[PDB]
Scaffold this motif. Structure first.
Motif, short mmCIF file in Angstrom:
data_model
loop_
_atom_site.label_atom_id
_atom_site.label_comp_id
_atom_site.label_asym_id
_atom_site.label_seq_id
_atom_site.Cartn_x
_atom_site.Cartn_y
_atom_site.Cartn_z
N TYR A 7 0.81 -1.22 0.00
CA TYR A 7 0.00 0.00 0.00
C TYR A 7 0.83 1.27 0.00
O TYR A 7 0.37 2.33 0.40
N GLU A 8 2.07 1.14 -0.45
CA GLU A 8 2.95 2.28 -0.55
C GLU A 8 3.62 2.18 -1.88
O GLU A 8 3.70 1.10 -2.46
N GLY A 9 4.07 3.31 -2.40
CA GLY A 9 4.73 3.27 -3.67
C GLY A 9 5.36 4.59 -4.03
O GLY A 9 5.00 5.63 -3.47
N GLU A 10 6.36 4.52 -4.89
CA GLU A 10 7.01 5.71 -5.38
C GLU A 10 6.04 6.32 -6.40
O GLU A 10 6.04 7.53 -6.63
N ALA A 11 5.20 5.48 -6.99
CA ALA A 11 4.19 5.91 -7.94
C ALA A 11 2.94 5.14 -7.55
O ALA A 11 3.00 3.93 -7.31
N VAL A 12 1.84 5.86 -7.41
CA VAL A 12 0.56 5.27 -7.07
C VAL A 12 -0.39 5.84 -8.12
O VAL A 12 -0.62 7.04 -8.16
N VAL A 13 -0.89 5.00 -9.01
CA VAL A 13 -1.79 5.44 -10.06
C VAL A 13 -3.05 4.57 -10.15
O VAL A 13 -3.09 3.44 -9.64
N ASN A 14 -4.07 5.10 -10.78
CA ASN A 14 -5.32 4.38 -10.95
C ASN A 14 -5.41 3.78 -12.34
O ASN A 14 -4.92 4.36 -13.31
N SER A 15 -6.01 2.61 -12.44
CA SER A 15 -6.14 1.95 -13.73
C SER A 15 -7.01 2.80 -14.65
O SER A 15 -7.95 3.44 -14.19
N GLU A 16 -6.68 2.82 -15.94
CA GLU A 16 -7.47 3.54 -16.93
C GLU A 16 -8.38 2.55 -17.65
O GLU A 16 -9.49 2.87 -18.05
N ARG A 17 -7.89 1.32 -17.79
CA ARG A 17 -8.65 0.30 -18.49
C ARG A 17 -8.17 -1.07 -18.03
O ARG A 17 -7.02 -1.23 -17.64
N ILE A 18 -9.08 -2.04 -18.00
CA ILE A 18 -8.76 -3.41 -17.61
C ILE A 18 -9.12 -4.29 -18.80
O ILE A 18 -10.21 -4.19 -19.36
N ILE A 19 -8.17 -5.10 -19.24
CA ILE A 19 -8.42 -5.98 -20.36
C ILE A 19 -8.16 -7.41 -19.90
O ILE A 19 -7.02 -7.87 -19.87
N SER A 20 -9.23 -8.07 -19.51
CA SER A 20 -9.16 -9.45 -19.05
C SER A 20 -9.32 -10.36 -20.28
O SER A 20 -10.11 -10.07 -21.18
N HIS A 21 -8.57 -11.45 -20.33
CA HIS A 21 -8.64 -12.35 -21.46
C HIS A 21 -10.09 -12.80 -21.68
O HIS A 21 -10.72 -13.29 -20.75
N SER A 22 -10.61 -12.64 -22.90
CA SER A 22 -12.01 -13.00 -23.21
C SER A 22 -12.36 -14.47 -23.06
O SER A 22 -13.52 -14.81 -22.82
N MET A 23 -11.37 -15.35 -23.21
CA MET A 23 -11.57 -16.79 -23.08
C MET A 23 -11.10 -17.36 -21.72
O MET A 23 -10.74 -18.55 -21.60
N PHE A 24 -11.03 -16.50 -20.71
CA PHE A 24 -10.63 -16.92 -19.38
C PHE A 24 -11.72 -17.88 -18.91
O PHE A 24 -12.91 -17.61 -19.09
N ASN A 25 -11.33 -19.02 -18.37
CA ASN A 25 -12.30 -19.97 -17.86
C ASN A 25 -12.09 -20.07 -16.36
O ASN A 25 -11.11 -20.66 -15.91
N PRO A 26 -13.03 -19.52 -15.57
CA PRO A 26 -13.00 -19.51 -14.10
C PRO A 26 -12.92 -20.89 -13.46
O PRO A 26 -12.30 -21.05 -12.41
#
Lengths: 230, 230, 230, 230
Positions: free
Chosen positions: A63-82
């Motif tokens: 929870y600490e960092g020299e750089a702390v940024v927020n995601s702009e986009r999430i690209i999860s693999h479309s064929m991910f099988n849970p």
């Protein structure tokens, strides 16, 4: 990481810490790898249902960092099988972060490395997942890469596939819950060979191999979705 | 908790910290309330798909406790609706823990209290959820209980029901992600009136009310499932 | 090493294990660094009165090696001072050993590196000296290099000199007896910056800095005695 | 021990393993004999310059023990001559250890035994010294006690004295470096007759006799210094 050792800031400059908020409002933690100024590679099981992600870079302290940024986009693999963890990879696009002494990218396989299975090679896995200890400090350990044939017999049929790379945990050192999405690296070559994907149903101290997403199998997907040629 | 106060050990001896391992191997954090030597009351959205939980009791520091115990069983409300958060209650059976200065149960409503809606009373909410500060210390704040009618106006129709109790966050002091399952208590009476259930779609810093499971609505279920009479 | 971690064979390919027989017939253990096919660099306090040395190379297991050779000649610094540990360096000439995957030399400073003091840099120290545990496996840890001025105040006047380089052990991780002569390395640069020389009179768990022979101060002596230009 | 037999726990319950830390910070190994609940008899050449010793009792595995104790005090013979090995005896006071199946004292000579030279008797010597095999298990062998006259012929004049007792190693079975301080015992009598003192300048594989401190010659010193009567 169970039975790991403490890292110091700068030891694993490519390590990303992900504080994830899900669609159901739950807060999850996963690791990730910085592969470019604007991209983090992690596991799909971590973020397939994420709404937002706070990315921490440049520090061994959670929870600490020299750089702390927020995601702009999430690209999860479309064929991910849970159910089988098949295609357990995802990309998080982040605002351009400048590399520093504590924030550096990990190298991705290319050329001949794409056909290397890395059998019987010692690799380094790191993360802030469950450990025997109470610590907010990044931990790491070494796991020997085993061949898929040996790994496949340790799980129900169909789980271990070509796109899986396994690490042996017979010495009691192992990634554990919260380590998901973290880097499995050939330190000598500063090369990312796997992404922590799954632990045996028997748990982290079962001595069973741990499954990782085999990075060489996803290089096309990575280049196509990031548009970057590695 | 956003804009809350910093607690310390012994201040909220009924507060449980829950390190949850899900069926999908993700690691989740939620709060809970110690209601008996062997039982923790929390939110169904936290553990409905959990396989195990490490319960931290007796310490204001996250992942620390005077008593650190593993769940023996988890009972999540069978009629829990993930989409509406209806019936958002769950119980975690733990091995008998002895009450101490830092570990004490919270009172549950009985008799006439069971008919009280607790409108316009200040209640105390506590947890280790997002706070816009990187602290590992338990936070708390006071939120005014508002009537369901006023609260329903702020949410999509059908979300706020009779089994929902809302806390106003217009002061900008509000529970946030990670506070889920936490206690909402009338301090002076040492009475548990709500379990943190959901934040507004607008986020934690929108001054919108936060929904809690109205404990008086689940007292029958709690007694049925714990086999304890209150 | 106190509070170290276990190495695997091939992790520290430059590490040498020295089984030393003294003039008084006692058997001593020290570490060393492979700096050439025919040379091991170690501490003078380890071998100034040695009669013979069995050198182990290529294995994390103590008293084992991919190459096990006997010393041909021992060259202890002529101005070594036993009372102050001044000039605590020595060379062991060995029969030519071919480099392999588990036996590789460590690089020595040259050019600009010769004027670098390496202050506030994390370095790796390794050896088979006393540890909290019972193990024949090579251990290692990380120590931050501190400036000589800060180090000098932790010892009696005159002990810390220009030719000394100190490592901080305030975190409880420290070289201990038997680690003498071992390598203190900047892993990133595969560079040997120090040779384990001395532990505080207060012991290995005193939190006091550990003294090492500063390699940059002995490069002329090394090149002159090995005849090798590094 | 060169060409010896492999012992096992419980076989030589009087054997002490000594991990010695010297004033010069070197780590040395020597054997010793448990002669009382609080005393270990060993060689002066082992500890005359020692600062502390970790004593391993009750196990045939090196650096392992049923009882692992730290020295409280070390008493080395004040008239020890490093050059001739004259008066090579020392005592290590340890905190009272309870005898068990694996930890038992060895008998010391008294009365008439004090006048016996033990010529031509087979005695048993044991230790973890050099064995031409990489084992961590205690070794032992039988050496015939020869008369001092015959022994003196094999050493430079003045080395073999009345307080020296020699063991023949012509069979090629011999104590070696690291066995120093070990017990030389008449098995059938469970009597300690010598302490391993010195190997021949010719080495361990020369069939030359090995010198031991003749215990009967130091019984007065032992009683004087331990305050115990035998």
């Amino acid at each position: 990481i169970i039975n790991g050792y403490e890292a110091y800031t700068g030891l694993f400059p490519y390590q990303a810490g992900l504080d994830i908020t899900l669609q159901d409002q739950r807060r999850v933690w996963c690791g990730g790898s910085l592969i470019d100024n604007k991209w983090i590679l992690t596991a799909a099981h971590c973020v397939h249902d994420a709404v937002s992600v706070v990315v921490y870079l440049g520090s061994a302290v959670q929870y600490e960092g020299e750089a702390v940024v927020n995601s702009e986009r999430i690209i999860s693999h479309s064929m991910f099988n849970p159910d089988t963890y098949l295609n357990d990879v995802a990309l998080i696009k982040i605002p351009h972060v400048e590399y520093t002494d504590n924030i550096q990218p990990i190298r991705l396989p290319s050329g001949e490395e794409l056909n290397n299975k890395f059998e019987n090679i010692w690799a380094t896995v790191s993360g802030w997942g469950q450990s025997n200890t109470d610590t907010v400090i990044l931990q790491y350990t070494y796991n020997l890469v085993i061949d898929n044939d040996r790994c496949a017999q340790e799980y129900p049929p169909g789980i271990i596939v070509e796109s899986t790379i396994c690490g042996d945990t017979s010495d009691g050192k192992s990634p554990c819950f919260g380590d998901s999405g973290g880097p499995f690296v050939l330190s000598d070559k500063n090369l990312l060979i796997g992404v922590v994907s799954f632990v045996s149903g028997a748990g982290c101290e079962s001595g069973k191999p741990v499954g990782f997403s085999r990075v060489t199998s996803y290089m096309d997907w990575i280049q196509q979705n990031t548009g970057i040629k590695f």
